[PDB]
Each structure stands twice: as structure tokens, then as C-alpha cells.
Design a protein around this ligand. Structure first.
Ligand SMILES: Cc1cc2nc3c(=O)[nH]c(=O)nc-3n(C[C@H](O)[C@H](O)[C@H](O)COP(=O)(O)O)c2cc1C
Ligand SMILES: Cc1cc2nc3c(=O)[nH]c(=O)nc-3n(C[C@H](O)[C@H](O)[C@H](O)COP(=O)(O)O)c2cc1C
Ligand SMILES: O=C1Oc2ccccc2C(=O)C1C[C@H]1C(=O)Oc2ccccc2C1=O
Ligand SMILES: O=C1Oc2ccccc2C(=O)C1C[C@H]1C(=O)Oc2ccccc2C1=O
Lengths: 197, 197
């Protein structure tokens, strides 16, 4: 199969979610060595903000920026549809995903391409995929009312067709080195049983 | 009192939430004519994305961008703390708030300035405010599991100290002109009873 890995942290080499994504990649190479792996770093290779000009590109003549945004949109969507296993690193910043991941989503959700309207409702067109979300947090939010990242990621991914999603959590990072080490260990075992299952 | 109005739509003059915000302003001038009103349009006056360079500004020597981001942060925070009634236009795009509003939040949430850590927990420092959220949506999501915007806005605002929040909804816009007119009418009556209460 082909694996797509999306990195979205702004902390580069010090990112906890990037370290876990690299672990996921190392283990998939190990266990499934015939597979291809593509990594896109949405912080090191930024997607532009969706503004009032660029929204027109996804929807007569187009401006220079509009033409670039559309070309970028078609590229991102093709890449997404060309891979089988989608890994998404989703650190929580101010109770939301990172703006780096958000901008990718805003260029990826497009009527008649990644979803469509029908009489049985709106319908996702990115089908047959398996997704794994790796979500790191400073505090402890899991299964509680301050975690809106988790259900938002299920809702958005479900909307474009990706209903098979598994979640891996690295929480309690802000409490220090030893809690961060525990988070890393626990998340890595969660990953191990996904890679082998 | 002083009213702050934050606009975040990317659709300019065709925005449903901007039309409702202008109505709110017209009626507050009408009923409370001694008050001052400040409007910031976060689409027409964009806040930059929070990246790995700018996060350093909110936290030794600082780069040129870092210095600008910090100056902008201090301005936004002072403005927020200087007003009594905070009105926030929050259109839903791809099941999230707009990136234009998000960037404002990412520059506004800052340790030791808008919140702080204590032994009774983290604690908001923007206190004594009343907030009204005007949230427009194409579909119908209210009180259901696809509305993650509403609880995310309660959580983020509560975190910086603003626990008094009222919500005004304009839903069903994508169903056409007459449903949009109904949404406008219903939201406007919601606004009328806030302005007079
Ligand atoms: C700008 C900023 C905002 C943050 N907001 C939250 C927060 O909302 N809740 C939380 O539990 N931790 C928060 N944290 C801590 C991060 O979630 C934590 O450091 C996590 O490891 C981030 O993943 P990363 O290291 O891969 O970037 C924040 C950190 C920063 C940089
Ligand atoms: C980029 C884009 C994404 C949208 N996503 C959603 C959606 O997630 N759910 C929904 O009900 N409507 C969605 N809509 C419709 C808007 O929520 C609706 O048009 C609303 O009026 C937006 O507020 P505004 O007119 O003030 O910009 C979307 C529209 C656009 C432009
Ligand atoms: O829950 C916590 O309790 C603490 C107690 C003492 C010292 C640090 C912390 C934390 O970092 C967090 C997590 C934490 C959080 O829960 O929400 C946030 C929102 C915005 C920015 C940062 C954060 C956090 O670090
Ligand atoms: O629920 C709906 O049902 C429809 C039936 C027929 C024609 C149009 C629509 C809609 O626009 C929506 C709302 C709607 C929605 O619920 O989610 C979205 C997510 C991303 C982008 C746009 C949207 C929408 O327009």
C-alpha cells in the first residue's frame, strides 16, 4: 500500500507529534517494507490562508493567485486520493488544530471533487481510506468537554469520505520531561498495535 | 459603555454575519447613543498566521517579524481589555471558525497577559466582559453533533476569562434567498432582545 503522512506542528524538531510520526514511518518501513511512504510537512511547506480571492479558485477568468491556489488544490487532492493509509499529526493549539493543518483542509474540501450534494444528503468522495490521527496536547483533555479537536477531526474527515479513523493521544506534555516521556511511550505502543494489526 | 465588534467573514459585502453585525451596531447607536463602538474587520485587516518564528514573540533578542507580531499582539490585547461588550462574527467554514478569526485568537491567548497558571488551575485575566457571538451557517447544525464551533467558542472565551457569552444563530443559508431572509429575520429579533435587555 501507500502511506501519506501529514505533519502540522510549528515546533519543528522539538515537536512531540513529529517525533511520533517519524516513529510511525520507521515502524511501517520495518513491518511493511514493500510500501511507499510520502511525507508532507505543512509547516515547512506552508499552504496559504483561504481568503476572499482564493475561495473563488475552488468554485470566469481567474487572477494569478487564483490560478496558483487551484493548481495547489488539485495537487493536494490528487496526492490524498493516491494513497491508502492517511496519517495526520494534529497538535492542539488554543483548543483548535494548527492553522497549518486547517489551511490544508480549506484547500482540500471542494464541491464535486472531495464531496457532493445528493437527495440522501451531502456525500464524501474520498473513499476506501484508512486514517490515523496522532494528537499531542500539553494538558489532559481526552474524553472530556475541552476536547473539541477529536470530534471536529471525525466530523471533517467523515464529510470528505474518510469514516475509518483511529486516534492516538500524547497528553500531559506541559507537566514536564517525565510526563512527556510517558506520553511518548504510551502513544508508541498505540502505534505498534496499529502497524501490526 | 464601549462595544467591540470583530468581523471574520471572507465574503465582504455579501457576508450574512457582516450584515448582522452592522444591524447590531445600528441598533446600539439607536438605543445606547452615548456609547463608543469600535469595529475591526479581520479579513480586510488580516492577522498573520502563528508560525514557529512568531510563537517566540509571545513567549533573548527578537527578529524583525517577531517585533512586529509582538507590537500587534499588545495592540489587539489592549483593545480587547479596553471595551465592555465584545461582539464576535463567527461564520462556520469547513466545520471550524474562519482562519481570519483564528489568527486573532492565536495572537490574543498569551501566558501572564490574557491567562495564567495557578494551583486552583489555569485562570483567565480578561474579566468583567459581556460577549455576543453571531454565527452563520449554510446548513442546520444547532444543538447537534456537527456543531463544534459553538462549544469551542465557549471553551476558548472561558479560558481567557469571558464566561458571559450569548449566541445568535443564522442557519440554513445554503437553501436559498428565502431561507437566508428567514435566518436574517430570526437573528435580528435575537439581537433586538439583547440590545434592549
Ligand atoms: C501556541 C500554543 C498553544 C497551545 N495550546 C494548548 C491548549 O490549547 N491545550 C493544551 O492542552 N496544550 C496546548 N499547548 C501545548 C501543546 O498542545 C503541546 O506542546 C503539544 O506537544 C503540541 O504538539 P507539538 O509538540 O507536536 O507541536 C499549546 C502550545 C502552544 C505552542
Ligand atoms: C469555504 C466555505 C466553507 C463552508 N463550510 C460550511 C460548513 O462547514 N457547514 C455549513 O453549514 N456551511 C458552510 N458554508 C456556508 C457558510 O457557513 C454560509 O455561507 C455562512 O453564511 C457564512 O457566513 P458569511 O456569509 O458571513 O461568510 C461554507 C462556505 C464556504 C465559503
Ligand atoms: O492544564 C494545564 O495545567 C497546567 C498547570 C501548571 C502548569 C502548566 C499547565 C498546563 O500547561 C496545562 C495544559 C494547558 C491547557 O490545558 O490549556 C492551554 C491553553 C492555552 C495554552 C496552553 C495551555 C496549556 O499548557
Ligand atoms: O446541509 C446542507 O444540505 C444541502 C443540500 C443541498 C444543497 C446544499 C446543501 C448545503 O449547503 C448544506 C449545508 C452545508 C453543510 O452542511 O456542510 C458543508 C460543508 C462544507 C461546505 C459546504 C457545506 C454546506 O453548504
Amino acid at each position: 500500500s501507500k502511506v501519506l503522512v501529514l505533519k502540522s506542528s510549528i515546533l519543528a524538531g522539538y515537536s512531540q507529534s513529529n517525533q511520533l510520526s517519524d516513529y510511525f514511518v520507521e515502524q511501517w518501513r520495518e513491518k511493511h517494507s514493500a510500501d511507499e511512504i510520502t511525507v508532507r510537512d505543512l509547516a515547512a511547506n506552508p499552504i496559504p490562508v483561504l481568503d476572499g480571492e482564493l475561495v473563488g479558485a475552488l468554485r470566469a477568468p481567474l487572477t494569478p493567485r487564483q490560478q496558483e491556489a487551484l493548481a495547489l488544490s488539485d495537487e493536494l487532492i490528487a496526492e490524498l486520493k493516491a494513497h491508502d493509509v492517511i496519517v495526520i499529526a494534529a497538535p492542539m493549539y488554543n483548543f483548535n488544530i494548527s492553522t497549518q493543518l486547517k489551511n490544508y483542509f480549506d484547500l482540500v474540501a471542494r464541491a464535486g471533487v472531495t464531496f457532493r450534494y445528493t437527495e440522501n444528503g451531502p456525500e464524501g468522495l474520498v473513499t476506501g481510506k484508512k486514517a490515523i490521527v496522532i494528537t499531542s496536547r500539553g494538558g489532559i483533555h481526552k474524553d472530556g468537554p475541552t476536547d473539541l479537536v477529536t470530534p471536529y477531526l471525525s466530523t471533517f474527515l467523515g464529510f470528505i469520505g474518510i469514516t475509518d479513523v483511529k486516534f492516538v493521544f500524547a497528553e500531559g506534555i506541559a507537566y514536564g520531561p517525565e510526563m512527556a516521556a510517558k506520553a511518548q511511550s504510551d502513544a508508541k505502543a498505540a502505534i505498534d498495535s496499529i502497524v501490526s494489526a
